[PDB]
Amino acid sequence: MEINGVEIEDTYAEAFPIKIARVLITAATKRWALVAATEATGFATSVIMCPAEAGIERLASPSETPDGRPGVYVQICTFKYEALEEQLLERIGQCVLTAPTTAVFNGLPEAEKQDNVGFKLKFFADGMESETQIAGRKVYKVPIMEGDFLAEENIGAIAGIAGGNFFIFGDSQMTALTAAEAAVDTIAELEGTITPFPGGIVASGSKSGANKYKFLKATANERFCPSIKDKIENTEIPADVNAVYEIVINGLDEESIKAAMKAGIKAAVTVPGVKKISAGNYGGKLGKYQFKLHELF
Amino acid sequence: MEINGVEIEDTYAEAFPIKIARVLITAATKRWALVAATEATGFATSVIMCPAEAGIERLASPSETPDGRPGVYVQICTFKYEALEEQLLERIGQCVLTAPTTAVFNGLPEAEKQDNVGFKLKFFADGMESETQIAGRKVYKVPIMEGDFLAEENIGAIAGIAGGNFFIFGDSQMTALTAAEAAVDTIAELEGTITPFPGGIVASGSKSGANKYKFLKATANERFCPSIKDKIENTEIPADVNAVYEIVINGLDEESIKAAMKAGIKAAVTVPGVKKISAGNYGGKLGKYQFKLHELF
Amino acid sequence: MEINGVEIEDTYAEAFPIKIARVLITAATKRWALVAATEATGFATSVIMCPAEAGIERLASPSETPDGRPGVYVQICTFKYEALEEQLLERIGQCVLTAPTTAVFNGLPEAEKQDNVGFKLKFFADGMESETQIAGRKVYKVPIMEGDFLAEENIGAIAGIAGGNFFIFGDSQMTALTAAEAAVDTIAELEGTITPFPGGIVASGSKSGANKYKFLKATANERFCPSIKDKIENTEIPADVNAVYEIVINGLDEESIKAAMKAGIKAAVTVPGVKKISAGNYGGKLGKYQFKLHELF
Amino acid sequence: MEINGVEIEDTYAEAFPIKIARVLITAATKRWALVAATEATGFATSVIMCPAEAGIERLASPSETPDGRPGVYVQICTFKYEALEEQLLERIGQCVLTAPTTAVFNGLPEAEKQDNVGFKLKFFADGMESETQIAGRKVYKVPIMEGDFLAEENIGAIAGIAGGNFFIFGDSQMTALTAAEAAVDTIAELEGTITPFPGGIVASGSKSGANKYKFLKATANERFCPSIKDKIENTEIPADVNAVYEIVINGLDEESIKAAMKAGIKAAVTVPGVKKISAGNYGGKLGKYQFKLHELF
C-alpha cells in the first residue's frame, strides 16, 4: 500500500493498557495556558523510567471551557491509579497551582474514578479556602499571591491506551524529522490523544532487553539504527534511508489512537524524501491493543 | 529607594545552598534545542515536592558550543549530590537522549565534582557504543534510530544557591505578570542563573508553616494574598495592589544571583502600574545567603 | 448589559465595503506556513496608508488542504479590485514564491471575481514551468532553487467588509492588552475574519480629520486617550480606566464579523480589570454596515 | 576547501550599494517588540518589487535600550534616501505607532543622514503632543488609546550593502532548509546585518534577464533548479543534491556582512547531508561589492 508514493508496510502497532487522567488547564491567554501545561507534563516521556507519561492533548477554545478562557487539555499516565493520583497531586500542585493565571478543571467529568485533587489542593490556602460554582462545577478557590487559584473538586481518570505508534523512514535526518514534526502538529489538533516524547517525537527507539548488557530493561534496537546498518545484517534500514523517527501515541480509546495514527501518517508522507511508514510491536505477546496500519485507510 | 518611581523595599531575599549541575544541550536548530531543554527541566519547580529544581539558564550560540551548533544551557538542582546524579541520569536519558538531534556536553567542565552521565548512558547502545573526541572533549557515541547521540563523559556540579528572589506588586494581575515576564526574559539572557517556576514565575508564594492545617510543611502566606487582604489585618498588600508575583532565582554563585535580581527588578519597574518591589525571607533564621535589595544598585 | 460584570456599551461599529482576496498558503510545517503568511501579510494594517490591509484568517489543518499539508488562510484587502490584483501579485510573488516550502491555493474557489495570479507567476520559470492537478484543482509548477513552487491558477476575490471593531477599556495598560490578546487569539480560530493591525491590535485609534492639523487624513481621537483625559472636557475615558485597545476585524460576510466580535468580546471580558466594552463608529453617515454590540448576545 | 567535511566553493557573493535606516523598537516584553518589528519589516524581501527591503537585525537587551525595556533592532532599506523616508514614515507610522506598547528610538544616532520621523509622527497627536528626554535623546510623546507613544526625533541612515549571500546545497529539501534555518538564527544574533527574505531564506533565487520571457527583469536560474537538472545541460546541481537555499544578507558595512556570511556558513555545515556551500554573483559586472567565500575563513 502507498500513500503519496510512500510505502505503508502491512504491519501493526502493539499498544498496552494504561491509567490516564485528563485535566483542563485554563489561563489568561494561550501562552500562559501552554506554559503551565508544558511544565506540568515535562519529565514524562515514558512511565518505564519517568514519574509518568504525560503531554498536551489539544488546545481548548475559549468557547468550550467552563470559564470561557483559553486552555490546554493534558493527559497524565501511569500503570497504577494510585501513582496517578500522586502524579496529579505533585504535577498540578507544583506546576499549575504555582503557574501564572491558571485554573484547573476536570477533563473526564463522567469517569468512574474521580481523584479529589481540587479538594486536596484547597488546604494550601490554610483556612482561607472558599467553595464556588463555575458552569455547574464544584470549584475551590485558593487565595495565593496572584489572586484566586481555582481548582475543580475532581479530576477524572479512565483506562486508556499507551503505545500506539508509527515509524517514519526518511532519506535524511531532516526529512524524517520534518515528517515527524508535521505528524505531531496534526495529532496535537485532535481530541483524545497525546504524544509524550520530547516534542512528541522518539529519536532513540528501543528493544526489550539486550544482547550484550542483559541487566538493562531496554536498549537501542540495533536493527533501526542507520549509522551502524552495515554492521547489522538483519537491518531494517535500507540503503536509501538515513534516519528513522517514531511517533508514540497514548489516548483514551482505540478510535482516537487510530485517528491520530491515520492523520499523522498522512501528514508525514507529504514531506519529500520519506521512504516508508511502519510500526513497532512485540509479536502479539505483550500489548492487548493492536493497530493495523492498513485498516486506517 | 525608588526605581522608575517604583518603591524598592529595604529588605532582603533569603537563599539556601543547593547542588547544581550545568548541562549544554545542542541540537540541529534553536527550536529543537529548546524542545529538549524544556522537556528535561519540566516537573521541577521546587525540590520540596518535585523530583528536582531545574530550568533554562540561557541559549547557547553556535559560536560558543563544542560542536558549533545552537544549544541551551540548563541547570538541574537538588539538595544532595546523590539525588543529582540520579536526576541527571533520568532527565537526560529520558528527555534528551530521546529528543530529536540532541547532543549533551558538560556545562561545568572545570568543576571539582563530576558525574559520569555519558559513560552511564552509552550502555543503551548495547555493544554498539563508540568513543570519539569533540573539541578536545571526550564523547560517547550511542547509535539510535535518528543517527548517533553524542554525550560527553561527565557533567559537572557545584555547591550553588537556590531561592534568590524578588516580589512584584502590581495594580492589576496583568501588570504584575507582564513585569514578571519581562524580568524572566531578562534573566534568561544572563549566565549562571535559572528561574525554575512555571514560566520562571511564582504565582503562589508560601509561608514556612500553617495557621490551621498543621500537617502541612508550607502553606500560602495569607499576608501577600490580595483577594483576601481585607480579612487579613496584618496584610502586606496595599489597597491599590491587586496582585503579586515572585521570581525565584537559583544560580552558581552569589554574583550571578545578584546580577539576575538587579536586571530582573530593573526590567520589572518599566511596566506601568507596578507599585512596589519586595523580596521573600525567613527572618534570617533559615538560609545562609542574604541578598539585600538596596545593595543591588 | 453586562457580560462577566463588564459593561457592554449600547452602541455599534461602523464597517465599510472592501475587496477581499482569500489565499491558502501550505508549507512543509505549520512553522513555515506561518513564516510565509506573516511576511506576505505584513506592512498591511490600514489601506489608508499601507499598500493593503491583510492578515492571517486562521490555520489550515492537513485534513482540509488540497495537498494534505499544514497551511494558513490569509486575506488581502483593498478598495479596488485592480489594486487587489497588484497586491496579490507583489505579496505572493515576493513573499510566498520566495518563501521555503510554500504552495499557494485559491481560498475563494467558488467566487465570481478570479485574479489569475497562478498563471502570471508561472512565467518566473522562464520556459521550465508545467501544469498539474492537485485535488481537482489546476496548478502550475514553477521550478526554483528549492524544488517546485506550486501555485493554483486563480485566486478568488469578493466584496467583503472592513472595520468591524470593539474597544476594550481596562484599569491598566496590561489589563486592556491581555484582554485584546485573548480576543485576537480567539478570532484567529475563526473562519472568515482577519485582524489586520499589529498582533491584531490597535494601540493608536483615530478620528477623521483634525482639530488643529486639518491637512491630515486621520489623527488620534483625543477623547479615547487616557493619558490626557483630565485636559479634555469631552473625554470618553472614565477615571478608573488607564488604557484602551481596539480590535479591528475585516471579514467575508456579516455573519463572520459578528461571530468574531461576539467571540472576541466574550474572551476580552474574562480578564480581571476590564471596565467597559464599546465600539467605534462615524455617526451612521460614512459606513454601510452597522454591527450593534447588544445584538451579538 | 572544506568545513566539517562540506566543500566551500571558491566563488564570491556579489553585493550592491543600498540606503539603510536603523530603528530601535522597544516594547513592554520581547513578544510585543517582536510583533511590531515583524509587522513593520514585512512585505520587504526585495526592493525590486517590494516597497522596501527590511528585516530584524537582532534583539536588544533591556540593559542596552534607552528606556530599559526589551527591544528589536530593524533595518529598512531602499536605493534612494527619498524612498527611504517615505518607507520609515509609513512602516513606523502604520505598524509601530499602531502596535501595543512600542516606543521608537534612533538606531543610527551618529549617521550624517537623519530623517526626522519622530517630529513628523508627532502631528498624529493633533496638538496634544509634547517633548521629553529619554537617556539624553529628544523624544516626542504622542497620546494614543493605549497611553503615550514615544518616538525619538530622528532615525539615522547610511549607504550600506545589499545582497551578500551564500547558497546551501543539500541532499534533500529539509536538509538544506534546516541548514538555512540554523544559519538565519545565527545571523539574527549578529549586529549590523539583516536577512530580508521570508524567514531570512531564499527559496527561489534568480538570474538577470530571461531566456524566453524577455518582458521580465529577472527569472529563475534554471542552472540551480534541482527539479529540472536533467533537462538543463548547464546545471550547477550535482546528482546527489536535491535542494538549494540561499541566505541573502544586507548590512551596514563589509565587515558585518562578512561576519554574517562566515557565521551563517559555519552553522549551515553542521547539518548532516549538506553537500556544498556556494554564493551568487553577477560575473562581477553589476555590483560594487564581491565577498569571496574562501577569504572569509
Swiss-Prot record, chains A, B, C, D:
Superkingdom to which the source organism belongs: Archaea
Keywords, sorted A to Z: Acyltransferase, Cytoplasm, Methanogenesis, One-carbon metabolism, Transferase
Listed EC numbers: 2.3.1.101
Catalytic reactions on record: N-formylmethanofuran + 5,6,7,8-tetrahydromethanopterin + H(+) = N(5)-formyl-5,6,7,8-tetrahydromethanopterin + methanofuran
Pathway: One-carbon metabolism; methanogenesis from CO(2); 5,10-methenyl-5,6,7,8-tetrahydromethanopterin from CO(2): step 2/3
GO molecular function ontology, one term from the record: formylmethanofuran-tetrahydromethanopterin N-formyltransferase activity
SUPFAM superfamilies hit by this protein: Formylmethanofuran:tetrahydromethanopterin formyltransferase (SSF55112)
Record-level GO BP terms: methanogenesis, from carbon dioxide; one-carbon metabolic process
GO cellular component: cytoplasm
Location(s) in or outside the cell: Cytoplasm
Top EC class of this enzyme: transferase
A Pfam cross-reference name: FTR_C
Family designation: Belongs to the FTR family.
Subunit structure comment from the entry: Homotetramer.
Function: Catalyzes the reversible transfer of a formyl group from formylmethanofuran (formyl-MFR) to tetrahydromethanopterin (H(4)MPT) to produce 5-formyl tetrahydromethanopterin (5-formyl-H(4)MPT) and methanofuran (MFR).
Protein's recorded name: Formylmethanofuran--tetrahydromethanopterin formyltransferase
Organism of this sequence: Methanosarcina barkeri (strain Fusaro / DSM 804)
